[PDB]
Write a protein that binds this DNA or RNA. Structure first.
Ligand SMILES: [Mg+2]
Ligand SMILES: [Mg+2]
Length: 326
RNA sequence: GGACCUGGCGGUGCUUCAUAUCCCUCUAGAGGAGCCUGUUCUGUAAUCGAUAAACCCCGAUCAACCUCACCACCUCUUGCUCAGCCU
């Protein structure tokens, strides 16, 4: 039973980490060019060019960002394996945020690159369709000890009930760290929350630049397409402990990933609970190494907020440049 | 009829101070978030109940298709060992 400090935990990012220049610093590393070639073969366009140099507005579109993040995450895993083989050898857990979950399974030997990427493509397209279906959006909110989230959601619904719309949606969509949440639903609700922050005791409020209300019932139309896409795919037993976003626990048997991966589409993301499940321990016990295989450093900040002692042994795989030309 | 005595109130309050423990003041930290437990109401035919008996092979852990426990149907019979149960 290895001492905590030798083992490693891989964290895969999700929506919102896209950035122009993604992939440079990973191409010359082994087996990455072939991965982008397979991405071309499956998608139908050149992901490599878009990630390397793109207008950032095409890259911000839902149909493109998710496959880009998936491919970049797996390329970063390849680079980390090249630099530090022991880190990949001694892996105890894996977790992804929204679409990075699909990456984690592929890293865990539960899926393959082609099938996983096809699933991600169908997911992104279906979500975009549902986003045009009804106007919707996402809002990140940081609260105080006096802040009531469900309560604020209730009046956020009361306003647009007074306006008049069918079963208005405004619910907490992402649990990411203490007192910081992301609420999802109609624009008028989130607009109401912005201007009643002071009443609702919100320190900060920031609209997420996303197309629609992810992880809510508004994305119900996108469940059935993705559902079909996962039937042909044969998921195996994950080799490492992969943690889910619906209920924030390990995937225990392969016969339930099929339905959890579709329930995630319309269920809040339990990221705080996943961090607690992976890192919570008695004071004085050591923590594992943590590697954010993928673009950005957001999960690093979220881990810093969630658990400082775990964050002390955190590092990120850089996907925008490389120190040595391999 | 006269004189005297004991008393008893398991009694009643107040006064002053010793009045330390206990106070009161005074000093220094302990509410939000996520999980797990206690109680209540509601609900089920039924137990969101337990692992000298699973899983895991960082810590812990939830339900695990482990297994025991509960509910609804059945089967076995002199059987394991003049058996068997932690009742
Ligand atoms: Mg039970
Ligand atoms: Mg028994």
């Amino acid at each position: 039973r290895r001492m905590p400090g030798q083992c490693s935990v891989l964290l895969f990012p999700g929506q919102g980490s896209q950035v122009v220049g993604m992939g440079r610093g990973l191409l010359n590393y082994p087996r990455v060019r072939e991965l982008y070639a397979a991405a071309r073969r499956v998608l139908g366009y050149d992901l490599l060019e878009l990630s390397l140099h793109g207008p950032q507005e095409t890259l911000d579109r839902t149909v493109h960002c998710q496959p880009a993040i998936f491919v970049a995450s797996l390329a970063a895993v390849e680079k980390l394996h090249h630099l530090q083989p022991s880190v990949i050898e001694n892996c105890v857990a894996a977790a992804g945020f929204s679409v990075g979950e699909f990456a984690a399974l592929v890293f865990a030997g539960a899926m393959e690159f082609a099938e996983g990427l096809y699933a991600v493509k169908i997911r992104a397209e279906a979500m975009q369709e549902a986003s045009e279906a009804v106007p919707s959006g996402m809002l990140s909110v940081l609260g105080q000890p006096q802040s009531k989230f469900n309560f604020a959601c209730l009046e956020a619904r009361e306003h647009c009930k007074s306006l008049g719309i069918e079963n208005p949606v405004c619910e907490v969509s992402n649990y990411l760290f203490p007192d910081c949440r992301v609420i999802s639903g109609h624009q008028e609700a989130l607009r109401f929350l912005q201007k009643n922050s002071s009443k609702f005791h919100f320190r900060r409020t920031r609209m997420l630049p996303v197309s629609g209300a992810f992880h809510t019932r508004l994305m119900e139309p996108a469940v059935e397409p993705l559902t079909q896409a996962l039937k042909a795919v044969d998921i195996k037993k994950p080799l490492v402990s992969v943690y889910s976003n619906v209920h924030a626990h390990r995937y225990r048997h392969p016969g339930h990933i099929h339905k959890l991966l579709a329930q995630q589409l319309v269920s809040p993301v339990k990221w705080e609970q996943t961090m607690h499940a992976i890192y919570e321990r008695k004071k004085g016990r050591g923590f594992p190494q943590t590697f954010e295989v993928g673009p950005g450093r957001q999960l690093g900040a979220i881990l810093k907020s969630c658990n400082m002692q775990a964050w002390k042994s955190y590092s990120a795989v850089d996907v925008l440049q490389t120190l040595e030309h391999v």
